């Protein structure tokens, strides 16, 4: 959660990030000072032009005055370019760094986090929030520093010619400051509400796009359209709140600083102020008040813009100091020696208050196969997900090679497991890239072909019009279901991991295809550790230990023949299949 801090506070938090890029900031500050000096000197040129008159005084200034103007414009252009380029460069580097940090943070979150989240919300953090940071820090930030520097120059030029009027400017400045204070807080609150609504908009569009087929066959167009109308109208209304605050704050602040113009006119009318200086300083003074009212308008509008990025930065910080996957193990394993043991483990899913597994005393020896069978919802995929530390157990210990799983580095632990999940997910790339997903430089194309041949996928790959270089859809949509399953099987088989978990990996396949895959698995996994979750008993008939699970407890365990004796649960499953 994010408490509205302030602009200065979020800049202090931003500094650890902006610190590598100090040089561009320093040069841009120098350029800004020079640019403001050029602006102020140009607007000061009046007093020579007026006092040293066109014909009243000798024409000695007006001859060189045009060249002074053109040269000051030359310098002003150069310094403005340098300042803008360097500030924009620093902002772009900061924004890219924050985007990369947010991506890495999301990639390091636990599985339960993604279970309780929506993809559209996080994608909104990546797209909308960071683009608000970028838009603010690039455009609005240049505008605010340049107009502040202009204002300071006009202040300096005014305190010089006649301080007696700069004093009223001094007294009004705090009022304008505290006004901008209050409006800025309002802007930041509105911007955070807008961030949340944009997350909702993205969630709605996401859910429509990924469930397009269900929308089409169940006639959901009305419901989705109505939902999107709701969220988009809410987005419009919050933008309207922001505009209301902006267009109510700008005129009031311009009304306040106009009192300076009223005061200078009253001071001029007063019979004791003039005659101190001739036509000249007071003309410069009135021109400088009229000038000064302009950067105020610019400053307030770009403050409306700028608080959006400030709020987005505050949200970013709140996300970046969240906790990630709990990783406090430091005993990396080069290659596990197969053994996996469950000791009286009890597991409850987050916020579900009923155990999914109760007292699991299950051994998976090295080189052996355990086959998990049982009805739907009994807890087999839960055991599979506990082996990989997707979730952490509540009681008991899961040991690998004699050591607790939590003792290990997460990355080191997961390098020991190759998993074909119940729900197959593929990436929108080629078949070879999908099979060697995260190891495209480590595995030869010959190794990829051997993997695809062990997965009975080599036949339908050779019938593709591009070979192993055919691009498959977003989730392998351009493939049949069994073909996607077989590709995921090949992906897991490419890595000769000591522990291989198949989670109903023959569900979308036909009997002959599964027999071929099972024959390949025979020789490849004769000395690997294997865990097979099957709802079909023909797949698991040769497993070393069959284990029957129900409601999260092991109810029987044994070999196929010993379990076909003993006339228990497995006997009933086998008889009715």
């Amino acid at each position, epitope marked *: 959660n994010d408490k509205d801090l302030s602009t200065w506070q979020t800049f202090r938090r931003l500094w650890p990030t902006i610190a590598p890029f100090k040089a561009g900031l320093i040069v841009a500050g120098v350029a800004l000072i020079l640019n403001a000096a050029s602006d102020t000197f140009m607007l000061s040129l009046l007093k020579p032009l007026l006092d040293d008159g066109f014909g009243k005084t000798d024409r000695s200034v007006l001859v060189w005055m045009p060249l002074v103007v053109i040269g000051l414009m030359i310098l002003r252009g150069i310094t403005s370019y340098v300042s803008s380029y360097c500030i924009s460069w620093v902002s772009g580097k900061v924004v890219m760094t924050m985007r990369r940090r947010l991506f890495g943070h999301m990639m390091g979150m636990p599985v339960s986090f993604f279970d309780k989240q929506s993809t559209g919300t996080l994608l909104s953090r990546i797209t909308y929030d960071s683009e608000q940071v970028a838009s603010s820090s690039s455009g609005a930030l240049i505008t605010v520093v340049r107009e502040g520097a202009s204002i300071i120059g006009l202040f300096i030029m005014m305190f010089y010619y006649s301080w007696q009027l700069s004093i009223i400017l001094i007294v009004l400045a705090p009022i304008v400051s505290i006004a901008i204070r209050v409006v800025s807080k309002r802007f930041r609150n509105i911007s955070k509400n807008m961030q949340n609504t944009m997350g909702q908009v993205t969630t709605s569009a996401e859910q429509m796009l990924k469930g397009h087929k269900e929308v089409l066959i169940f006639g959901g167009q009305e419901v989705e359209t109505k939902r999107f109308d709701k969220v988009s109208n809410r987005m419009r209304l919050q933008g309207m709140k922001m505009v209301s605050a902006s267009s109510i704050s700008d005129p009031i602040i311009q009304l306040i600083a106009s009192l300076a113009l009223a005061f200078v006119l009253y001071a001029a009318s007063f019979p004791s102020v003039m005659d101190s200086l001739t036509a000249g300083t007071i003309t410069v003074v009135f021109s400088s008040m009229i000038a000064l009212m302009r950067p105020l308008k610019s400053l307030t509008n770009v403050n409306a813009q700028f608080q959006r990025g400030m709020a987005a930065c505050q949200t970013l910080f709140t996300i970046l100091d969240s906790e990630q996957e709990k990783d406090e193990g430091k005993r990396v394993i080069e290659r596990a020696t197969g053994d996996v043991e469950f000791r009286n483990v009890t597991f409850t899913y987050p916020g579900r208050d009923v155990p999914a597994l109760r007292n699991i005393n299950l051994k998976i020896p090295a080189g052996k196969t355990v086959a998990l069978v049982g009805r739907s919802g009994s807890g087999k995929s839960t055991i599979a997900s506990l082996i990989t530390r997707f979730y952490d157990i509540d009681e008991g210990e899961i040991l690998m090679d004699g050591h607790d799983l939590r003792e290990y580095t997460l990355a080191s632990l997961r390098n020991q497991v190759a998993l074909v999940s119940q729900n197959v997910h593929l990436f929108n790339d080629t078949v070879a890239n999908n099979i060697a997903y995260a190891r495209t430089e480590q595995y030869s194309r010959e190794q990829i072909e051997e993997a695809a041949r062990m997965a009975y996928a080599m036949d339908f790959i050779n019938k593709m019009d591009n070979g192993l270089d055919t691009v498959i859809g977003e989730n392998g949509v351009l493939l049949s279901g069994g073909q996607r399953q077989r590709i995921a099987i090949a992906r897991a088989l490419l890595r000769d991991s000591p522990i291989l978990i198949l989670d109903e990996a023959t569900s979308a396949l036909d009997t002959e295809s599964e027999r071929a895959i099972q024959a390949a698995l025979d020789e490849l996994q004769k000395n690997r550790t294997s865990l097979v979750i099957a709802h079909r008993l023909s797949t698991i008939e040769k497993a070393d230990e069959i284990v029957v699970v129900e*409601d999260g*407890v092991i109810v029987e365990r044994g070999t196929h023949n010993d379990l076909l004796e003993h006339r228990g649960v497995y006997a009933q499953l086998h008889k009715m299949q």
Partner: nanobody
Amino acid sequence: QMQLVESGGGLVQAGGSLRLSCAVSGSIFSIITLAWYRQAPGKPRENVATITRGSRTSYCDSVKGRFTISKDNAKSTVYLQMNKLKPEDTADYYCNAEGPAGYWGQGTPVTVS
């Protein structure tokens, strides 16, 4: 650690009646499978009776209709009931919890005149 202890009988005459009990502790007794196995001096262990959560019972054909298998959840005790015993039943009887690859008790000898 779940452990299961047998309380059995001794020597009975032919055609007599016997009842063996097995107390199972440390178990989820309402769900796990329980069984009674037997072992003659020569032959290996052979499943005699099986009982499962839904109180469904099974038996070796050569003994169906004579033995009964029951379980009391409240006392968490499994029971084997002997009727019309024969000399071929003289053997060491074991109870078993959750499968032939699970947990076994000490076992009790039964002799038939």
